[PDB]
Write a protein that holds these residues in place. Structure first.
Motif, PDB file in Angstrom:
ATOM      1  N   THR C  37     -17.628   5.015  -0.135  1.00  0.00           N
ATOM      2  CA  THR C  37     -16.296   4.542  -0.450  1.00  0.00           C
ATOM      3  C   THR C  37     -15.340   4.514   0.744  1.00  0.00           C
ATOM      4  O   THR C  37     -14.481   3.631   0.824  1.00  0.00           O
ATOM      5  CB  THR C  37     -15.671   5.408  -1.575  1.00  0.00           C
ATOM      6  N   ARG C  38     -15.489   5.462   1.669  1.00  0.00           N
ATOM      7  CA  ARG C  38     -14.589   5.536   2.819  1.00  0.00           C
ATOM      8  C   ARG C  38     -14.793   4.501   3.915  1.00  0.00           C
ATOM      9  O   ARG C  38     -13.958   4.394   4.808  1.00  0.00           O
ATOM     10  CB  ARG C  38     -14.642   6.925   3.475  1.00  0.00           C
ATOM     11  N   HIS C  39     -15.886   3.748   3.867  1.00  0.00           N
ATOM     12  CA  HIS C  39     -16.138   2.754   4.906  1.00  0.00           C
ATOM     13  C   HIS C  39     -16.367   1.328   4.417  1.00  0.00           C
ATOM     14  O   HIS C  39     -17.008   0.526   5.100  1.00  0.00           O
ATOM     15  CB  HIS C  39     -17.315   3.205   5.770  1.00  0.00           C
ATOM     16  N   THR C  40     -15.817   1.008   3.250  1.00  0.00           N
ATOM     17  CA  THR C  40     -15.966  -0.314   2.658  1.00  0.00           C
ATOM     18  C   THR C  40     -15.220  -1.427   3.405  1.00  0.00           C
ATOM     19  O   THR C  40     -15.659  -2.584   3.414  1.00  0.00           O
ATOM     20  CB  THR C  40     -15.479  -0.312   1.201  1.00  0.00           C
ATOM     21  N   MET C  41     -14.095  -1.078   4.024  1.00  0.00           N
ATOM     22  CA  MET C  41     -13.295  -2.053   4.752  1.00  0.00           C
ATOM     23  C   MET C  41     -13.922  -2.338   6.119  1.00  0.00           C
ATOM     24  O   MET C  41     -14.330  -1.412   6.821  1.00  0.00           O
ATOM     25  CB  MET C  41     -11.865  -1.520   4.903  1.00  0.00           C
ATOM     26  N   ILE C  42     -14.022  -3.615   6.488  1.00  0.00           N
ATOM     27  CA  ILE C  42     -14.622  -3.976   7.771  1.00  0.00           C
ATOM     28  C   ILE C  42     -13.571  -4.246   8.843  1.00  0.00           C
ATOM     29  O   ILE C  42     -12.433  -4.609   8.540  1.00  0.00           O
ATOM     30  CB  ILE C  42     -15.532  -5.233   7.671  1.00  0.00           C
ATOM     31  N   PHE C  73     -20.122  -5.768  17.227  1.00  0.00           N
ATOM     32  CA  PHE C  73     -18.965  -4.946  16.873  1.00  0.00           C
ATOM     33  C   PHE C  73     -19.319  -3.475  16.657  1.00  0.00           C
ATOM     34  O   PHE C  73     -18.491  -2.583  16.856  1.00  0.00           O
ATOM     35  CB  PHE C  73     -18.312  -5.474  15.589  1.00  0.00           C
ATOM     36  N   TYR C  74     -20.547  -3.221  16.233  1.00  0.00           N
ATOM     37  CA  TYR C  74     -20.984  -1.860  15.976  1.00  0.00           C
ATOM     38  C   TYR C  74     -22.055  -1.412  16.970  1.00  0.00           C
ATOM     39  O   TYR C  74     -23.038  -0.781  16.591  1.00  0.00           O
ATOM     40  CB  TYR C  74     -21.517  -1.748  14.543  1.00  0.00           C
ATOM     41  N   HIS C  75     -21.859  -1.739  18.243  1.00  0.00           N
ATOM     42  CA  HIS C  75     -22.807  -1.366  19.291  1.00  0.00           C
ATOM     43  C   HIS C  75     -22.893   0.152  19.461  1.00  0.00           C
ATOM     44  O   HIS C  75     -23.663   0.641  20.287  1.00  0.00           O
ATOM     45  CB  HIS C  75     -22.381  -2.002  20.610  1.00  0.00           C
ATOM     46  N   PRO C  83     -31.385   9.718  15.072  1.00  0.00           N
ATOM     47  CA  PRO C  83     -31.180   9.890  13.630  1.00  0.00           C
ATOM     48  C   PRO C  83     -29.725   9.762  13.189  1.00  0.00           C
ATOM     49  O   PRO C  83     -29.446   9.426  12.041  1.00  0.00           O
ATOM     50  CB  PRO C  83     -31.759  11.275  13.364  1.00  0.00           C
ATOM     51  N   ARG C  84     -28.799  10.030  14.102  1.00  0.00           N
ATOM     52  CA  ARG C  84     -27.379   9.931  13.789  1.00  0.00           C
ATOM     53  C   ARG C  84     -26.960   8.452  13.746  1.00  0.00           C
ATOM     54  O   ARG C  84     -26.048   8.080  13.004  1.00  0.00           O
ATOM     55  CB  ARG C  84     -26.564  10.716  14.825  1.00  0.00           C
ATOM     56  N   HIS C  85     -27.627   7.611  14.538  1.00  0.00           N
ATOM     57  CA  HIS C  85     -27.328   6.179  14.536  1.00  0.00           C
ATOM     58  C   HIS C  85     -27.813   5.576  13.224  1.00  0.00           C
ATOM     59  O   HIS C  85     -27.084   4.835  12.564  1.00  0.00           O
ATOM     60  CB  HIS C  85     -28.032   5.451  15.684  1.00  0.00           C
ATOM     61  N   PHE C  91     -25.158   3.636   6.190  1.00  0.00           N
ATOM     62  CA  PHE C  91     -23.934   3.699   5.398  1.00  0.00           C
ATOM     63  C   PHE C  91     -23.020   2.499   5.636  1.00  0.00           C
ATOM     64  O   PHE C  91     -22.427   1.971   4.697  1.00  0.00           O
ATOM     65  CB  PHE C  91     -23.184   5.005   5.683  1.00  0.00           C
ATOM     66  N   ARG C  92     -22.897   2.068   6.888  1.00  0.00           N
ATOM     67  CA  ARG C  92     -22.065   0.904   7.195  1.00  0.00           C
ATOM     68  C   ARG C  92     -22.542  -0.288   6.350  1.00  0.00           C
ATOM     69  O   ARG C  92     -21.737  -1.059   5.817  1.00  0.00           O
ATOM     70  CB  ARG C  92     -22.171   0.554   8.685  1.00  0.00           C
ATOM     71  N   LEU C  93     -23.862  -0.420   6.230  1.00  0.00           N
ATOM     72  CA  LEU C  93     -24.471  -1.500   5.469  1.00  0.00           C
ATOM     73  C   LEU C  93     -24.230  -1.358   3.978  1.00  0.00           C
ATOM     74  O   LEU C  93     -23.788  -2.301   3.328  1.00  0.00           O
ATOM     75  CB  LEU C  93     -25.974  -1.555   5.745  1.00  0.00           C
TER      76      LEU C  93
HETATM   77  N1  LIG Z   1     -21.917   8.929   7.264  1.00  0.00           N
HETATM   78  C1  LIG Z   1     -21.118   9.014   8.324  1.00  0.00           C
HETATM   79  O1  LIG Z   1     -20.925  10.047   8.963  1.00  0.00           O
HETATM   80  C2  LIG Z   1     -20.444   7.703   8.732  1.00  0.00           C
HETATM   81  C3  LIG Z   1     -19.497   7.702   9.749  1.00  0.00           C
HETATM   82  N2  LIG Z   1     -18.880   6.502  10.125  1.00  0.00           N
HETATM   83  C4  LIG Z   1     -17.854   6.496  11.190  1.00  0.00           C
HETATM   84  O2  LIG Z   1     -16.584   6.013  10.718  1.00  0.00           O
HETATM   85  C5  LIG Z   1     -15.884   5.431  11.836  1.00  0.00           C
HETATM   86  C6  LIG Z   1     -15.574   3.979  11.464  1.00  0.00           C
HETATM   87  O3  LIG Z   1     -16.774   3.236  11.234  1.00  0.00           O
HETATM   88  P1  LIG Z   1     -16.724   1.842  10.432  1.00  0.00           P
HETATM   89  O4  LIG Z   1     -16.528   2.133   8.994  1.00  0.00           O
HETATM   90  O5  LIG Z   1     -17.922   1.073  10.836  1.00  0.00           O
HETATM   91  O6  LIG Z   1     -15.390   1.152  11.017  1.00  0.00           O
HETATM   92  P2  LIG Z   1     -15.304  -0.414  11.388  1.00  0.00           P
HETATM   93  O7  LIG Z   1     -15.229  -0.687  12.842  1.00  0.00           O
HETATM   94  O8  LIG Z   1     -15.687  -1.406  10.360  1.00  0.00           O
HETATM   95  O9  LIG Z   1     -13.720  -0.427  11.106  1.00  0.00           O
HETATM   96  C7  LIG Z   1     -13.209  -0.195   9.790  1.00  0.00           C
HETATM   97  C8  LIG Z   1     -11.962   0.693   9.850  1.00  0.00           C
HETATM   98  O10 LIG Z   1     -11.409   0.817   8.528  1.00  0.00           O
HETATM   99  C9  LIG Z   1     -11.678   2.145   8.047  1.00  0.00           C
HETATM  100  N3  LIG Z   1     -12.050   2.097   6.615  1.00  0.00           N
HETATM  101  C10 LIG Z   1     -13.044   1.372   6.105  1.00  0.00           C
HETATM  102  N4  LIG Z   1     -13.053   1.493   4.779  1.00  0.00           N
HETATM  103  C11 LIG Z   1     -12.057   2.309   4.440  1.00  0.00           C
HETATM  104  C12 LIG Z   1     -11.584   2.797   3.231  1.00  0.00           C
HETATM  105  N5  LIG Z   1     -12.149   2.423   2.085  1.00  0.00           N
HETATM  106  N6  LIG Z   1     -10.536   3.633   3.235  1.00  0.00           N
HETATM  107  C13 LIG Z   1      -9.957   3.988   4.369  1.00  0.00           C
HETATM  108  N7  LIG Z   1     -10.378   3.540   5.538  1.00  0.00           N
HETATM  109  C14 LIG Z   1     -11.422   2.699   5.611  1.00  0.00           C
HETATM  110  C15 LIG Z   1     -12.825   2.661   8.914  1.00  0.00           C
HETATM  111  O11 LIG Z   1     -12.783   4.091   8.938  1.00  0.00           O
HETATM  112  C16 LIG Z   1     -12.366   2.110  10.263  1.00  0.00           C
HETATM  113  O12 LIG Z   1     -11.215   2.820  10.726  1.00  0.00           O
HETATM  114  C17 LIG Z   1     -16.845   5.508  13.026  1.00  0.00           C
HETATM  115  O13 LIG Z   1     -16.642   6.713  13.770  1.00  0.00           O
HETATM  116  C18 LIG Z   1     -18.205   5.547  12.334  1.00  0.00           C
HETATM  117  O14 LIG Z   1     -19.191   6.172  13.161  1.00  0.00           O
HETATM  118  C19 LIG Z   1     -19.225   5.309   9.475  1.00  0.00           C
HETATM  119  C20 LIG Z   1     -20.173   5.323   8.458  1.00  0.00           C
HETATM  120  C21 LIG Z   1     -20.780   6.517   8.087  1.00  0.00           C
END
Ligand SMILES: NC(=O)C1=CN([C@@H]2O[C@H](COP(=O)(O)OP(=O)(O)OC[C@H]3O[C@@H](n4cnc5c(N)ncnc54)[C@H](O)[C@@H]3O)[C@@H](O)[C@H]2O)C=CC1
Ligand SMILES: NC(=O)C1=CN([C@@H]2O[C@H](COP(=O)(O)OP(=O)(O)OC[C@H]3O[C@@H](n4cnc5c(N)ncnc54)[C@H](O)[C@@H]3O)[C@@H](O)[C@H]2O)C=CC1
Ligand SMILES: NC(=O)C1=CN([C@@H]2O[C@H](COP(=O)(O)OP(=O)(O)OC[C@H]3O[C@@H](n4cnc5c(N)ncnc54)[C@H](O)[C@@H]3O)[C@@H](O)[C@H]2O)C=CC1
Lengths: 426, 426, 142
Positions: C37-42, C73-75, C83-85, C91-93
Motif C-alpha cells: 500500500t505504501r508504494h502504489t504511487m509512481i 527510473f529505478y536503477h 537479495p535486497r534489490h 514490491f515496486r511491481l
Molecule cells: N519493501 C521495502 O522495503 C520497499 C522499499 N521501497 C523504498 O521506498 C522508496 C521509494 O521507492 P518507490 O516506491 O519505487 O518510489 P518511486 O520513485 O516510484 O517514487 C514514488 C514516491 O511516492 C511515494 N509513494 C508511493 N506510493 C505511496 C503511497 N501510497 N503513500 C505515500 N507515499 C507513496 C514513494 O515512497 C516515493 O516517495 C525507495 O527508498 C525504495 O527503495 C520500495 C518498495 C519496497
C-alpha cells in the motif's frame, strides 16, 4: 387570408405569386417560383427578403416583444431555468419531470472534456484574449470528436448538440483560468449548471468555494436572457455555414466569432476601453467620459438597440436582477456607482433621449458580471456560451428543415471576357 | 436586356420596380425598398434572390464559362502562375513586372509562422484528420495575430490578407507532416510558391529534395484552377461571417470547414475509400459501386457538377496536366491506369450520361495528387489552401460594399404567445 | 487448491503465499499489505512517459512500454544477485502494476489519471483508479 389572395409581377410577361402569412408578424410573398420563370430580385442585405421559416423565437422590435416557443422571455427569466429553457428551445415544449431529469442527466454526464483537448489550451499564449482562445478550442473540436460530424445523421446531431451544451461552460472557465494563471477546475455533478460554472470560474484548490445562491440565480438568469435572439448576424452565420455541410462544432465556432465581431472594430474597440477605465466619479458623472462620442460604440457598452424601438424586453428582469446582486454583494461599490450615473444620463440626457441610447440587456449583465469580479474580456464569452443553445436550435431547424442548400446569384458588373497577356517574365 | 424592360409589382396598387443589368449574365429586379414599405419576399433556397453584386468572377453555367476579372480560366492556368492570379483576383488587373515582384516578395517573406502557433500542432491527436487540424489551427490564428483583426482598418485587412496567403501553404504542409509523423519543413525563400509547398510536403532532413519541374507546374495549376469559384456555399459562409465583422482568420476557418462539410457523411469518404484503395482495373470498377455508392458517392469522387451543364472548363488544362504528370512519373502512374477506365465509364455508362456525371477538374486533380503521393485526406486541404485567395477577394468586396451584414428576416410560423407554467423542479 | 484460495483468501494473501510458501500470520500479513500500500504511487517523471504515447495506441502496448522503461527510473534495484534489490523490485511491481494499468486505460479514453488511495483494498483501489473522475465521488460496489 383576407386580401392575402396573391399578387403579380410583370415586365414583358405576367406571373402569379402567393401571399404567405405567419402565425405572428407580417405577410410574405412567395417567390420560390420566380427563379424558374427567369425572374430574379436584388437585395444586398436581405432586408426586403425573408429567407426562412422558424418556430423557435419570435420578435416584434417595435412593441418590445420576445418569445421563445410562444413563451414570453420575462416569464422564462423568472419562472424557469437555463436547462429547462434549453429544453424548450430544442424540443418546442416545456419538459415533464421525467423528460427534464433525463435531459439534465445527459448534460451533467458529459461536462468534462477529453484531456487531450485540455492540452490544447496550454499551447496558447497567456496574454491572449479569452474570446480568441474560445474560438480556437471550439474550432478544434472536430479533430477530437470526428465521431459525430455528419449532420445528415440524427444521432450525430444529438450527440454533438449535447457535447456543446455540456462542454461550452467548461471551455469558457478554462479560457478564464488560463488567462489569470490559476489551475483548471473540473466540473462537479452535484452543482447546478450555473453554480458549477461559477465554481469552475472562481474556486482554487486552496479553499472550498461556496456559490452564493443569489449570484448563482443571477448567472442562471444572465444565461436564460442570452440563450437565443431570433435571426441576427451570428445566427445567420451558423445557418449559412451549417447548410454547406460544415460540422456542428465549426458552426458554433463561426457563431462565436460572429458574436465577437463588432468588438474588435477599431472605433468600438477604442471607446470600450474609454469606459472600462475612465471612471473616478469625476469623469463619467460630469459627462467627462461622455464628452467624447466621435464614434458611437454605444450598444457595445450596452446602449441602444438594433431591433427594439424603446426598450430591450430582456433588460427588464436583468435590471431587477442587477439591483438584487449589488445589494447582496454589499455596498463597497464606489466606482460601480457610475452604473447609476450612466443609467441616469442614458434616460435624461437630451442626446441619449433623441438618439435613443437606452440601456439594453447587456448594460445590466455587464454590471452584474463586473460586480462579480469577472473581467471585461470574458463578457462575450459568457454570452456566446449561453447563445450556444440558441445556435443549436437554429442549426437543428435549418437542417431538420429541408436542407435547401442554396447556390446564390450575384449580379455581375466586372469586366467582360478579355484575353490575358502577362506583363511579367516571372 | 431582352425581356428585361420595366416591371411592376401588383398588390392592390402598382409598384414599378426597375431592372438592373450586369456586364454579363442576367438582369435583376431591384427590390431593395420593398421591405422598406412592409412588403417582404419569401425565398428559401434563394432561387430568385441575388445575394450581392460582384466584379470578381463570372460563371455561365450552360456555357461552361469561367472568368477571373474577365480572363478565361484556360488562359490563366496555361500562361499564368498562382501568384500572378492571386494579384489579379485581389487587385483587379494583371500586375506590371514591378507590382508582381513587389507582391511576390511580400508573399514569400511572411511564409514562416510564429513558433508558438507551431506548438499548438503537437496538442492535436496524431490520428486527427489533416482537415480538422487545418480548421483548428486556422480558427486559432486570431489569438496570435491580434494586431490585424479590425475588419474596418484597411491596414489590418492588408496584413491579414498577406498573412493568410503566405502561411496557408506552410500550415497545410505541417498538417501532412504531423499526420505521418515526419518533422516539419520550414519555408524556402528561394523556392517558388508551388515548389515551396512541394518541399514542405515531401522534403525530409535525411536528403535534399528535388523539385520536379513538371510536378511543380502541375501543382501551381491545381492552385490556379481552384483560386476562386464565384458565389458558392463556402464563399457564402465567408461573406456572411465577414458581414458580422468577424475577423479575417475566423471567416477563412469558416470557409474551410464549409468546403469540407459535404464530405462528412458516413457514405461519403466510405465510397471515396474504395476508390483510391484499389489499383486494379477490374476491382474499383467492374460491377462494383453500380449502386454500392451511397449518399452522393458519385459527386464526391470528382464526377458531375451543379453549376456547369455540359462540362467543367477547369478540367481542360487539368486533364492535360494529368497526362504530363503520369507520363513524366511512369513509376507512379501506369499501375494507376484504372483512371482511364473510370473516365471511360463516365463517358459511356448509361447511368453516368443519364446523371450528367461527367469528369470534373477534381477528378483530374485527384489523379495528379494521387500520382504525386498525396493522400486523399489532403485533397480538400489543398483545394482550400488555393481557394483562400478567393475567399479573401470576396471578403474584401463584401467589405467594400459596406460590410453587408447578413441578419435576414424569418417567417414565424410557431406558437402565438402562450403563458408559461413549470410544475416541475430541478 | 485454487478453488479454496479463490473463495477463502484474497489476492494479497495469495500473493504472500506464492512468494513466501506459507499463509501469513496477522502480523506478517499486516506488514506485507502495508509495504504494498505504501508504494502504489509512481514517480511523477514516469507519468510524464504515458503522455508521449499516442492516444490511439493499444493499452497493452503502452503497458509493455512503461514496464520496460522502469529500469531507467529505478536503477537503484536492478542487481538480482542482491537479495535486497529483489525485495524492493518485487514490491515496486506488486504495488505499481495496477497503477500503471489504470493509467493505460484512462489515457486511452481521455480521462485524468487517478492517484492510489490507501484507504481502499487492492481491488477496490484498482476499480477506483479505472473508473472514478474528479466530477463525482466514486463508490466501489463490494
Ligand atoms: N519493501 C521495502 O522495503 C520497499 C522499499 N521501497 C523504498 O521506498 C522508496 C521509494 O521507492 P518507490 O516506491 O519505487 O518510489 P518511486 O520513485 O516510484 O517514487 C514514488 C514516491 O511516492 C511515494 N509513494 C508511493 N506510493 C505511496 C503511497 N501510497 N503513500 C505515500 N507515499 C507513496 C514513494 O515512497 C516515493 O516517495 C525507495 O527508498 C525504495 O527503495 C520500495 C518498495 C519496497
Ligand atoms: N445524448 C447522448 O446520448 C450523448 C452521448 N455521448 C457519448 O458519451 C461518450 C463520451 O463523449 P464525450 O462526452 O464527448 O467524451 P469526450 O471525448 O470529451 O471525453 C470525456 C470523457 O469524460 C467523461 N465525462 C465527461 N463528463 C463527465 C462527468 N460529468 N461525469 C463522468 N464522466 C464524464 C466522458 O464520458 C468521456 O469518457 C461517447 O460515446 C459519446 O457519443 C455524448 C453526449 C451525448
Ligand atoms: N504587407 C505587409 O507589410 C505585412 C506586414 N506584416 C507585419 O509583419 C509582422 C508580422 O509578421 P508575421 O510573418 O505575421 O510574423 P509571425 O508572427 O507569423 O512570425 C514569423 C516571424 O518570422 C518572420 N518570417 C516569416 N516568414 C519569413 C520568411 N519566409 N523568411 C524570413 N522570415 C520570415 C516574420 O516576420 C516574423 O518575425 C507584423 O509587424 C505584421 O504587421 C505582416 C503581413 C504583411
Amino acid at each position: 387570408a383576407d386580401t392575402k389572395a396573391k399578387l403579380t409581377l410583370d415586365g414583358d410577361t405576367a406571373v402569379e405569386l402567393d401571399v404567405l402569412k405567419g402565425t405572428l408578424g407580417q405577410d410574405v410573398i412567395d417567390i420560390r417560383t420566380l427563379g424558374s420563370k427567369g425572374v430574379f430580385t436584388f437585395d444586398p442585405g436581405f432586408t426586403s427578403t425573408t429567407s426562412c421559416e422558424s418556430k423557435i423565437t419570435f420578435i416584434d422590435g417595435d412593441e418590445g416583444i420576445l418569445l421563445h416557443r410562444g413563451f414570453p422571455i420575462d416569464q422564462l427569466a423568472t419562472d424557469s431555468n437555463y436547462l429547462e429553457v434549453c429544453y424548450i428551445l430544442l424540443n418546442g415544449e416545456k419538459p415533464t419531470q421525467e423528460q427534464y431529469d433525463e435531459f439534465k442527466t445527459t448534460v451533467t454526464r458529459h461536462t468534462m472534456i477529453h484531456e487531450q483537448i485540455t492540452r490544447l489550451f496550454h499551447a496558447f499564449r497567456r496574454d491572449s484574449h479569452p474570446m480568441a482562445v474560445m474560438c480556437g478550442i471550439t474550432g478544434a473540436l472536430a479533430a477530437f470528436y470526428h465521431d459525430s460530424l455528419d449532420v445528415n445523421n440524427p444521432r450525430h446531431r444529438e450527440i454533438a448538440a449535447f457535447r456543446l451544451l455540456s462542454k461550452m461552460p467548461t471551455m469558457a472557465a478554462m479560457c478564464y483560468k488560463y488567462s489569470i494563471g490559476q489551475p483548471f477546475v473540473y466540473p462537479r455533478n452535484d452543482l447546478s449548471y450555473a453554480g458549477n460554472f461559477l465554481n469552475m470560474m472562481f474556486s482554487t484548490p486552496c479553499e472550498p468555494y461556496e456559490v452564493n445562491p443569489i449570484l448563482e440565480r443571477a448567472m442562471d438568469r444572465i444565461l436564460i436572457l442570452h440563450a437565443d435572439h431570433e435571426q441576427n448576424a451570428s445566427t445567420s452565420t451558423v445557418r449559412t455555414a451549417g447548410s454547406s455541410g460544415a460540422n456542428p462544432f465549426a458552426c458554433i465556432a463561426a457563431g462565436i466569432a460572429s458574436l465577437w465581431g463588432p468588438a474588435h472594430g477599431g472605433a468600438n474597440e477604442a471607446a470600450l476601453k474609454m469606459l472600462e477605465e475612465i471612471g473616478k466619479k469625476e469623469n463619467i458623472p460630469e459627462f467627462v467620459r461622455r464628452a467624447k462620442d466621435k464614434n458611437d460604440s454605444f450598444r457595445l457598452m450596452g446602449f441602444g438597440h438594433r431591433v427594439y424601438k424603446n426598450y430591450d424586453p430582456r433588460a427588464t428582469v436583468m435590471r431587477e436582477t442587477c439591483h438584487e446582486v449589488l445589494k447582496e454583494l454589499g455596498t463597497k461599490d464606489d466606482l460601480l456607482e457610475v452604473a447609476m450615473e450612466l443609467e441616469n444620463i442614458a434616460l435624461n440626457d437630451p442626446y441619449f433621449i433623441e438618439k435613443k441610447l437606452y440601456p439594453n440587456v447587456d448594460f445590466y449583465s455587464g454590471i452584474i458580471l463586473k460586480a462579480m469580479g469577472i473581467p471585461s474580456s470574458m463578457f462575450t464569452v459568457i454570452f456566446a456560451m449561453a447563445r450556444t443553445v440558441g445556435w443549436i436550435a437554429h442549426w437543428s431547424e435549418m437542417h431538420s428543415d429541408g436542407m435547401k442548400i442554396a447556390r446564390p446569384r450575384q449580379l455581375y458588373t466586372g469586366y467582360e471576357k478579355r484575353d490575358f497577356k502577362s506583363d511579367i517574365k516571372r
